[PDB]
Write an enzyme that holds these catalytic residues in place. Sequence first.
Site, PDB file in Angstrom:
ATOM      1  N   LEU A  56       0.817  -1.190   0.000  1.00 48.67           N
ATOM      2  CA  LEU A  56       0.000   0.000   0.000  1.00 48.67           C
ATOM      3  C   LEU A  56       0.868   1.264   0.000  1.00 48.67           C
ATOM      4  O   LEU A  56       2.055   1.235   0.358  1.00 48.67           O
ATOM      5  CB  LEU A  56      -0.938  -0.024   1.200  1.00 48.67           C
ATOM      6  CG  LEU A  56      -1.764  -1.297   1.335  1.00 48.67           C
ATOM      7  CD1 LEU A  56      -2.514  -1.256   2.629  1.00 48.67           C
ATOM      8  CD2 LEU A  56      -2.738  -1.424   0.195  1.00 48.67           C
ATOM      9  N   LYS A  66       6.689  -3.159  12.232  1.00 51.33           N
ATOM     10  CA  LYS A  66       5.797  -3.104  13.387  1.00 51.33           C
ATOM     11  C   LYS A  66       4.494  -3.851  13.131  1.00 51.33           C
ATOM     12  O   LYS A  66       3.855  -4.294  14.091  1.00 51.33           O
ATOM     13  CB  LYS A  66       5.495  -1.665  13.783  1.00 51.33           C
ATOM     14  CG  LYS A  66       6.679  -0.726  13.702  1.00 51.33           C
ATOM     15  CD  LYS A  66       6.475   0.488  14.598  1.00 51.33           C
ATOM     16  CE  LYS A  66       7.789   0.995  15.185  1.00 51.33           C
ATOM     17  NZ  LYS A  66       8.746   1.245  14.076  1.00 51.33           N
ATOM     18  N   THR A  95      -3.278  17.014  25.928  1.00 50.52           N
ATOM     19  CA  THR A  95      -3.529  17.679  24.644  1.00 50.52           C
ATOM     20  C   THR A  95      -4.871  17.407  24.112  1.00 50.52           C
ATOM     21  O   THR A  95      -5.156  17.905  23.035  1.00 50.52           O
ATOM     22  CB  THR A  95      -2.483  17.295  23.596  1.00 50.52           C
ATOM     23  OG1 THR A  95      -2.641  15.928  23.223  1.00 50.52           O
ATOM     24  CG2 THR A  95      -1.114  17.487  24.133  1.00 50.52           C
ATOM     25  N   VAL A  97      -7.338  18.632  25.716  1.00 44.98           N
ATOM     26  CA  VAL A  97      -7.947  19.917  26.017  1.00 44.98           C
ATOM     27  C   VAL A  97      -7.711  20.836  24.813  1.00 44.98           C
ATOM     28  O   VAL A  97      -6.575  21.047  24.404  1.00 44.98           O
ATOM     29  CB  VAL A  97      -7.340  20.515  27.288  1.00 44.98           C
ATOM     30  CG1 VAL A  97      -7.847  21.925  27.481  1.00 44.98           C
ATOM     31  CG2 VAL A  97      -7.608  19.570  28.467  1.00 44.98           C
TER      32      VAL A  97
HETATM   33 NA    NA Z   1      -5.441  20.141  22.454  1.00 43.38          NA
HETATM   34 NA    NA Z   2       4.732   1.391   0.018  1.00 52.66          NA
HETATM   35 NA    NA Z   3      -5.472  17.037  20.434  1.00 51.51          NA
END
Ligand code: NA
Ligand code: NA
Ligand code: NA
Length: 327
Positions: A56, A66, A95, A97
């Site tokens: 892909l 992974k 984060t 918020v």
């Molecule tokens: Na944020």
């Molecule tokens: Na690729």
């Molecule tokens: Na965020």
Amino acid sequence: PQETLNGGITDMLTELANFEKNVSQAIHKYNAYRKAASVIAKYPHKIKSGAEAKKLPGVGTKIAEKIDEFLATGKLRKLEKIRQDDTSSSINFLTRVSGIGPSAARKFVDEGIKTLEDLRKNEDKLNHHQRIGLKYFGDFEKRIPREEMLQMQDIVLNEVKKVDSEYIATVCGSFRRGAESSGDMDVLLTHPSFTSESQPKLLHQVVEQLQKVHFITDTLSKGETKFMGVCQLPSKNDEKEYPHRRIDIRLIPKDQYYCGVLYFTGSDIFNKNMRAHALEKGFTINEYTIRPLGVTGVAGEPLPVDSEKDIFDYIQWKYREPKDRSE
DNA sequence: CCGACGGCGCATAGC
DNA sequence: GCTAATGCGC
DNA sequence: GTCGG
Ligand code: NA
Ligand code: NA
Ligand code: NA
């Protein structure tokens, strides 16, 4: 695709995504994983091999590895490592918020501010947007079921016309594409009285009225051309208060309107194909204008646009009704 | 090998 | 006070 | 992290 075929893989890549965005502050490694995570979701087979995915676009060698590890073991070592080191986790939580980016969050955690509890202890150390974001932390993570958007679109369109007959407004995003759920309300506004060659009371007067209808509760940011704040649908005294919703309202000049509407209705993949088609036929599109490309690749003066349809009429495409614009 | 990868409106140290 | 840089969200 | 000039 089914969000169920390769869920494990995409969850992982998305976990790694926010880690690079929020913790390592590597925003291009964040987009890479999302790209990766988003093309895997659209694959109509259960992946069996890292290499099978590498085929892909946007899945490269390390992401295949992974994936190999994930299918082999059922977890990612790196991802477990990250999951328990607690700086990373706290920075990651904060984060969520709105108004707390990776920098603030890192600083908060540096001085030992790591929970919502901690944040409301210190609401003095927070700017305005962040306090609003803290106040609505739960509601902002909620989906907006289409049927709500409809009734919202109603209040904003109806009350915008109670202001000036010649305003024209268009909710966009997934909602104009027929999507059953929307993350927020993105409105696009214009007025005949607003050109490229251009009142600065134009966006204000709509927000001012929309604040009288008790629809818009809070303001994250407001200027001559962009507003960003919080609305809420009205509860009919029957003890079920609707969750507060994120709404933006852009004021764009009418000669760039339908390019604005066309861009901010997207979709994202749709746009790169429409541009790239437009590019491969003498023209070039952005959010503001459609321009003709000379033999040199140098663009001319922007073409007139009165309807969204006029864009397809230049590039010799047939109007797509938004529902069919997902790619 | 190695730079590009989205660009811009609004809120918020340096001079 | 004025200007430009940066965080942030989109 | 991946893509492509
Ligand atoms: Na944020
Ligand atoms: Na690729
Ligand atoms: Na965020």
